[PDB]
Symmetry: C3
Subunit: 334 residues, 3 copies
Amino acid sequence: DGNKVDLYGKAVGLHYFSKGNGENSYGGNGDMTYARLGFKGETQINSDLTGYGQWEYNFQGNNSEGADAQTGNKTRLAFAGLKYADVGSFDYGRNYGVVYDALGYTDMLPEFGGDTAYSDDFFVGRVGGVATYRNSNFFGLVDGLNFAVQYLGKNERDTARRSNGDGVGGSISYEYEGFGIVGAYGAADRTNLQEAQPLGNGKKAEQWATGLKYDANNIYLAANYGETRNATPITNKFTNTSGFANKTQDVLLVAQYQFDFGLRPSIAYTKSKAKDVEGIGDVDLVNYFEVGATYYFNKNMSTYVDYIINQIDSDNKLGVGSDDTVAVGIVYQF
Amino acid sequence: DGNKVDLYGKAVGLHYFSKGNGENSYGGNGDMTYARLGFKGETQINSDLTGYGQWEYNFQGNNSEGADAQTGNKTRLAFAGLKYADVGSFDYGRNYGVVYDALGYTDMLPEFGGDTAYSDDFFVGRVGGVATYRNSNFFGLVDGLNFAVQYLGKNERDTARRSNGDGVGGSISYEYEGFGIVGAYGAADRTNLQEAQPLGNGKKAEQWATGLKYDANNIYLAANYGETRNATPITNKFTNTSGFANKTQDVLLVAQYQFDFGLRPSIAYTKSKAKDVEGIGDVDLVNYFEVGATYYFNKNMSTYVDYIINQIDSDNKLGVGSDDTVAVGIVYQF
Amino acid sequence: DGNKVDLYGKAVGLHYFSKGNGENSYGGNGDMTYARLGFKGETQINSDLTGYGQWEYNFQGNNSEGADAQTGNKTRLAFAGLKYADVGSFDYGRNYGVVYDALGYTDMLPEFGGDTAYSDDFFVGRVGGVATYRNSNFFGLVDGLNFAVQYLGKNERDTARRSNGDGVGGSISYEYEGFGIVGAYGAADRTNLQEAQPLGNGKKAEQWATGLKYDANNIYLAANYGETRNATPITNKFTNTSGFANKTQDVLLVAQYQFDFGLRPSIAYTKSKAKDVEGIGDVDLVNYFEVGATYYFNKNMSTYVDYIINQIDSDNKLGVGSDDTVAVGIVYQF
Ligand SMILES: [Br-]
Ligand SMILES: [Br-]
Ligand SMILES: [Br-]
Ligand SMILES: [Br-]
Ligand SMILES: [Br-]
Ligand SMILES: [Br-]
Ligand SMILES: [Br-]
Ligand SMILES: [Br-]
Ligand SMILES: [Br-]
Ligand SMILES: [Mg+2]
Ligand SMILES: [Mg+2]
Ligand SMILES: [Mg+2]
Ligand SMILES: [Mg+2]
Ligand SMILES: [Mg+2]
Ligand SMILES: [Mg+2]
Ligand SMILES: [Mg+2]
Ligand SMILES: [Mg+2]
């Protein structure tokens, strides 16, 4: 009856290599195997109207069958919506925060990358309780011009890190001839639990980002810049103190090429600097170069290596790990 | 070849609006998105015999991807059985309590309702370890006459609220010309842990209900009345004390219409009164009117609003919420 | 596009009968209902090369929908790999040890059996972080001659029971005209947390087993013999101390017949004895006879009974359970 639903997923055999047991590395050390399961469906309601829904789950494959069986298991996405011919889509539930419309540009590495797209972090990553309106080609009048607004409902959780107040954010993008340019901005109230943390001071959190990319002829090139206020979560590893960076400035870059025979090498740089952090001043949160590659056997099977050359120094005042990490992956997906 | 199984699910974007906080409301306040996933299968073994099984899970969509990720996640149903031609069906596992053959009559609202069909609550909701026998049209000899019996095995759990002793229950119903009537009753042993609770006293739990319904010509009218002894779970928020109501008296009413263009308005009333509650006597547990509507775009897509006009008063002796609660939902299902 | 993926699972209505709880039985008492869900996929990359992946999850059906909802839920398998023409298969993730290549011989009972194939126990059961290479028919040159090697990456977990160090293990088998013979062995480092336990002492865990089987003409006969040194997990029930048996010796015998009409009687014997147990000396871990049966209605539906005649005596120095257990099961699978 014009419903299309496709159960999807992957099994990801994954191993991280880092110094020691990886307490002072970028990614850690050991087994990091996991699996994904989801559905994605879409129903033709009439000529002009589609309904749709999606759910996606993370099942870790590197816990025992003992008491730790559920460590890092979670729902990543859960949302439903309606899409109306020449007017836009509207969805609600657990979904990507708008500002990920910009950060998605550089979140293209075989394993790492994407460092500033925190989950449960306002308009940066996948969160809870968002209403999202999206528009393609400006109601159909302007090919390549897209925009979105997103309404974030307050989530007063048990942890400051996973909480938020009410907020609004949005995004505008233009694509033309393989190039793409995009800007995204959100702000939200911070909750009383966030204000009580040692790190971070202010009533509102803000995040913004811009992106430029070239995505054509088997070349992928992209850059993202942005900044945040009272929005980037941080932990002092020395004091076990936590909260949010009063300011960050963040800059990511990525260069890839896709060979017809399956190989797709990747080169990147990422740097995120916190400022005005209490007791500290300026610090680096992320600072690295990346070399990697993915080999695609076909649409269902790939392998990959991903090497993070970590520029964080062993000095780092927040305890951010300074050692390198290499990831090795085998993936079956459907 | 012989076998039919169909993966099923829904994604529900869901939001509740109450004063506060929602501490003092019927339903709470904020994001309540969730998803469901299940399978349902039937195999033709021969001409007279079919095997079947069902599993159903709830994935909350309004938790973070942190330490609270698993909150409210659970298996709803997990059972397997055989259905023999003129004998009946026999199944075992986690399934609906028998007395829910009565309560289902009124559990028909867009979001709320069904207030007395508690889970893990002897016979009124989905419970563990039930062997259920069911019969259609009295061995095929009496059109519209159905019955069932169910054996509940002891579950001594860590919690009095989620426990039970051994029990037996059943249900009888007759349907004719769009009308339906149905009686159900179960009784069981209480566990020591339940007897140790300050609220509620008795060796035995009991629950019964009767149902009346009209279900034709696009009209749905239904009413349930019931009582319980030592069965309905309760809390006194003034004392942080818990247990079970020595007695309750329960009445639910529902009226709905289905318009061919998809709109289905709903009107309801629910009162549940506890009696003989230690240090209190009588006290309402539930008391409200409902108005709502579901808009069905088709078999896969729907939206709804449900408004609960809460008649509980701010003097209620157990601290039961007195504020209403409006729910708004968007549903993709397959 | 040359991909075949099956979603699969089962619903198992399951009940165990034992004296009392029974806190002193082989298997326990009460509702043991569960379900499984998994996918299994295979993609033809080219005429000589296949990709594959598998995920499998256990969903308990005997928990309430309260705080205990998650007890016993776990990923059993999560792996992906490549299979090349005659050269062999390579996979990584959570998978069966390499010593279960032998123990699978007798792990054939309707419900029980398989006592020495502990999960998260080096090479005997399902684990986390294994790299497994497998070869059939010695590169296509010797019909019926198969072998495998497996590399076990260290998992330092919160618990001694679920930890391992790095190890290697392997297996070799040979089948000809319904007869089968197998040998398997592995060794790995113990972790410091393991060595810190009062029970067990040694740098290295080791496990080995051999198997003979006849599997033809509806007869199934199999035997396994095995030993372990610092690998088999134990608890002293009197003193509440835990660790690993310094040694064990294990025998598991099985006989079954498959009638064409669906019945499949089973008879078994299992004994595992620990030696050099701190504070104790020699003591039986498992000692029983089995007598059960499985009735297959078809490929999707079965029932079974499994009766374990426990020869553990009430004298057991470790407090191992001595009473019998009977299981009754109903299974829908797809
Ligand atoms: Br995926
Ligand atoms: Br994160
Ligand atoms: Br559903
Ligand atoms: Br029920
Ligand atoms: Br309703
Ligand atoms: Br409930
Ligand atoms: Br299965
Ligand atoms: Br191909
Ligand atoms: Br185990
Ligand atoms: Mg773990
Ligand atoms: Mg502060
Ligand atoms: Mg600030
Ligand atoms: Mg460095
Ligand atoms: Mg009492
Ligand atoms: Mg009121
Ligand atoms: Mg020791
Ligand atoms: Mg005995």
